[PDB]
Amino acid sequence: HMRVEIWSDIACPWCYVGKARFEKALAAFPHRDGVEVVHRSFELDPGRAKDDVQPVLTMLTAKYGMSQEQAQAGEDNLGAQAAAEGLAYRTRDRDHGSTFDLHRLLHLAKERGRHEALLDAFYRGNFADERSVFNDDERLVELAVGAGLDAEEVRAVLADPAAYADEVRADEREAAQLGATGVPFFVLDRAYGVSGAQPAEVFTQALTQAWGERTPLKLIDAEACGPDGCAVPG
């Protein structure tokens, strides 16, 4: 088979839309049975302070020198494209903050086999839900418990800043080495990079090309165990 790695941040509307687009493409791919999907941490703003939560629309108009009209229109468009993938998406009063701790908790999840459940919870918590996922540990606890995780434990991870920090940074490091400066970023078989919330069409194409072009392995050759037992040479 082959592996598809997907770098994303929770505070990234196209990561949320692009995940659904990819999954839709994957479900129509002829070798979906041979594909493993691995989610990977990325922070769009790793330097941001935990207590720095801002309204999205303020951020667009203030931080990006864009009009309020234009800000609203981008969000309306994102709401339309989210609906079209079967995702809820609030087009008003969204907020934005640091995701570092969310990512540490995603690694707790990845190591409780619940990675995709907590990822979807956090996305839902962010984009579908009026309550903030930022600077609110009890919110993360509730979202995490809802995803199957244990609470005393999720709390221990949140209480201990070093808990899973290495793992978050290592994912971020790997993305930086692979050339990604923006998410979502999809790496198909460590041969092809796909960037942004592409049409399921492109994703389908990317899967097929990536699959199609894997050459058999190149061997280097000694003692082994095989259908007729183990070696005894020296």
Whichever of 72 and 135 has its CB closer to a copy of itself, that residue is 72
Whichever of 146 and 179 has its CB closer to a copy of itself, that residue is 179
Maximal C-alpha separation, the chain: 78
For the bound state, the minimum distance from the C-beta of residue 201 to Na ion, rounded and expressed in Å, comes to 31
Q: Does 211 bind a copy of itself (CB under 8 A)?
A: no
Whichever of 138 and 221 has its CB closer to a copy of itself, that residue is 221
CB 84 within 8 A of CB 144: no
At 96, give phi and psi (nearest 5°): -155, 135
Neighbours of 72 (CB within 10 A): 15
Name the residues that contact Na ion, by CB under 5 A.
126, 129
Distances (CA, A) of 81 to 13, 27, 49, 215: 10, 19, 30, 37
Cα distance between residue 70 and residue 22, in whole Å:
27
Residue with tokens 């005894």: 232
Cis peptide before 184 (omega within 30 of 0): yes
Write out the two tokens for 19: 């995940």
Cα distance between residue 186 and residue 19, in whole Å:
10
CB 123 within 8 A of CB 10: yes
Q: Does 157 bind a copy of itself (CB under 8 A)?
A: no
- Encoded one letter per residue, x for contact with a copy of itself by CB under 8 A and - for no contact, window 163-202 reads -----------x--xxx-xxxxx-x-xxxxxxxxxx---x
Cα distance between residue 186 and residue 7, in whole Å:
6
For the bound state, the minimum distance from the C-beta of residue 131 to Na ion, rounded and expressed in Å, comes to 5
Q: Does 51 bind a copy of itself (CB under 8 A)?
A: no
Given 32, 90, 112, 155, the residue binding a copy of itself (CB under 8 A): 112
129 binding partner (options Na ion, a copy of itself, none; Cβ < 5 to 8 Å by kind): Na ion
Q: Does 47 bind a copy of itself (CB under 8 A)?
A: no
Q: Does 152 bind a copy of itself (CB under 8 A)?
A: no
By CB under 8 A, name the binding residues for a copy of itself: 1-3, 9, 12-15, 17-18, 34, 44, 60, 63-64, 70, 73-74, 77, 81, 111-113, 174, 177-179, 181-185, 187, 189-198, 202, 205-206, 209, 214, 216-232, 234
